[PDB]
Amino acid sequence: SGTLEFITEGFTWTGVTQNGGSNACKRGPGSGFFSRLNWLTKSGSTYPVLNVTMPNNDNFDKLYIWGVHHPSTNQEQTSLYVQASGRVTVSTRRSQQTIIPNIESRPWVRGLSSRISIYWTIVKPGDVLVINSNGNLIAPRGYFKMRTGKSSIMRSDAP
């Protein structure tokens, strides 16, 4: 694509707390998170079933980056998402990706045993993005505009 042109979208996330962060991902003196991702957690004592839609009315392909949180313990899972087992589904008119997060401890990396699994979806013009979640969703903040070009990437240590 040869570009990281990101367009922010509003996305209404009702009944949940937005902009979650961590000390593993500090921005400035305080905690933070991936700028292009939105960490959703429970609001009060409930994490409702999210059911948001974002249509593509433009004349181009949209690339969306989203993720799924994998807690290290069952208590972590419940403190964040209330329900013992979360679920994340993103869909379009022709395709679909469903994932049930697994609760599991990993070797400590940057003081953490938990992880996030990154996924991606492409939405063609006239198509619609549908996101459904009862838990563990790492929501997108918008999309990356896709291009077809003469660009590439190379691994090198040359000046």
């Binding site: 003469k150 660009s151 590439s152 691994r155």
Partner: protein
Amino acid sequence: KFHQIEKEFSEVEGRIQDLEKYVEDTKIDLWSYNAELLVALENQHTIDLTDSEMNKLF
């Protein structure tokens, strides 16, 4: 040529990696043959046309 396939791998993956390696190894062998042959044919012809030029003068 711009965007192409990966040609170096840090880890052992499996079936797809073996194919990517094979495709490139195949490509290089075919072009290395074309290069060797081309220069041989060109050199032989250069040696002949220069000898020919001498005889034409004679």
